[PDB]
């Protein structure tokens, strides 16, 4: 998509390494917030979108929580706390046509600069000057929509680079889609580290009688930390019983 | 390219419509504006209508409004304008050209006019 | 339409007769041979970096914005529409250069 108007696919119930992600020399960056990239590996997610769009080089390092500049101004604004990553590649030889590409686009003119996530496809003249907009244009009222027109022969900064932005989610709601890593067998009434659907711990993981209702998956403590899961193969209630320790 | 192949004498009666047609260069429709114009034969000419090819989108002066009509496509740059309201007294030649695109162009300005339409329209 | 005659070789200048309002940029004057496809003469307007370059221009006055056409060669004498932009779009009739005798 245009920047302004950019892609969203909301990803659910499947699993990925991302390693094939980072591990690629195609990536010109792979820019991270609250996260770690050969470290997604162990976790799942309750959903990811991967929010996703062309810019030119020089607009890759607004691309953050807590920045301000046209992009993140006029056509995608990250949340001043974004999670995930920022993966980007020169796309110059994808995206750039001969005559110019001028089917990639950005906005630099509203009533007011987006909110985050706060997707707009307006395209009503805008009022640069004193006149009023009648609909036309030609001096002092404008289109608010720029083109970049992507020619191949660009500079490198002005060149296009493909954008993924792997907004990840993290809900009350449990995980939907997995790392690439192999479960193993449950170990009860014993000491053990553990990772349930993400939910990294170390306890003893005792069966339990706790009346789960069909929608409830973690139990938890006045702590606001977890007391008990659902497992997510076989849908037993385990008691995470605390690690056995005192002093000495 | 530069003269739009605009459709010729459009020979028509009163209450009705034409699709006038025309032409511009392949690529045109990420690039520009089409806007619309009628004049009187050796008479003063008027601005009629635009529409903005990529959405398709456009727009017509009040007098035009319902009586005129604007397509294109977006593939080819071909451009259409159903006459949707025609008049004996509609006789006029019709025009259009390549314009606009915003602070974007160096100046709004029109510069391929098509080579123009004489709707011939009687009772 | 309103005429002016000239001879080959003078310097025209005519006002925008659309120029009720003044405009903070001018668009452009369309030479017609009367009634046929219109032709840009002068383009880009209220700037210098306008027209065809051998000949033109339309900063003459701050309003009128004149088909200032700089030497007349005789495919010159025309009909001529002229046009100007701030929320803006419409054509004046401009006046028409004639061959004098």
């Known amino acids: 998509a245009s920047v302004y108007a950019w892609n969203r696919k909301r990803i659910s119930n499947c699993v990925a390494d991302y390693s094939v992600l980072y591990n690629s020399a195609s990536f010109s960056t792979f820019k991270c917030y609250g996260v770690s990239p050969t470290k997604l590996n162990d976790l799942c997610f309750t959903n990811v979108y991967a929010d996703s769009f062309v810019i030119r080089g020089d607009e890759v390092r607004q691309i953050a929580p807590g920045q301000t500049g046209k992009i993140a101004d006029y056509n995608y604004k990250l949340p001043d706390d974004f999670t995930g990553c920022v993966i980007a590649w020169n796309s110059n030889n994808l995206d750039s046509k001969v005559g110019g590409n001028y089917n990639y686009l950005y906005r630099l003119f509203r009533k007011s600069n987006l909110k985050p996530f706060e997707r707009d496809i307006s395209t009503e003249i805008y009022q640069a000057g004193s006149t009023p907009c009648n609909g036309v244009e030609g001096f002092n009222c404008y289109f608010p929509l720029q083109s970049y027109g992507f020619q191949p022969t660009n500079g490198v900064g002005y060149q296009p680079y493909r954008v993924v932005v792997l907004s990840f989610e993290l809900l009350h709601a449990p995980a939907t889609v997995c790392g690439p890593k192999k479960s193993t067998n449950l170990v009860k009434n014993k000491c053990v580290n553990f990772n349930f659907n993400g939910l990294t711990g170390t306890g003893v993981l005792t069966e339990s009688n706790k009346k789960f209702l069909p929608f409830q998956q973690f139990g938890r403590d006045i702590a606001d930390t977890t007391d008990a899961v659902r497992d997510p193969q076989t849908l037993e209630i385990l008691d995470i019983t605390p690690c056995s320790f005192g002093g000495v | 390219q530069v003269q739009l192949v605009q459709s010729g004498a459009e020979v028509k009666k009163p209450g009705s419509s034409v699709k006038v047609s025309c032409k511009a260069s392949?690529?045109?429709?990420?690039?520009?504006?089409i806007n619309w114009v009628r004049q009187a034969p050796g008479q003063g000419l008027e601005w009629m209508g635009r529409i903005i090819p990529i959405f398709g989108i456009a727009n017509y002066a009040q007098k035009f409004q319902g009586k005129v009509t604007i397509t294109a496509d977006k593939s080819t740059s071909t451009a259409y304008m159903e006459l949707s309201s025609l008049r004996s007294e509609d006789t006029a030649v019709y025009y259009c050209?390549?314009?606009?695109?915003?602070?974007?162009?160096?100046?709004?300005?029109?510069?391929?006019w098509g080579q123009g339409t004489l709707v011939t329209v009687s009772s | 339409p309103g005429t002016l005659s000239l001879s080959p070789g003078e310097r025209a200048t005519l006002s925008c007769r659309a120029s009720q309002s003044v405009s903070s940029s001018y668009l452009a004057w369309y030479q017609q041979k009367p009634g046929q496809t219109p032709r840009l003469l002068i383009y880009?307007?209220?700037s210098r970096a306008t027209g065809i370059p051998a000949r033109f221009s339309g900063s003459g006055s701050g309003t009128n914005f004149t088909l200032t056409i700089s030497r007349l060669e005789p495919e010159d004498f025309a009909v001529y529409y002229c046009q100007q932009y701030s929320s803006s779009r419409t054509f004046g009739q401009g006046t028409k250069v004639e061959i004098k005798r």
């Open positions: 392949g690529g045109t429709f990420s690039r520009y504006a």
């Open positions: 880009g307007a209220s």
């Open positions: 050209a390549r314009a606009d695109y915003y602070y974007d162009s160096s100046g709004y300005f029109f510069d391929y």
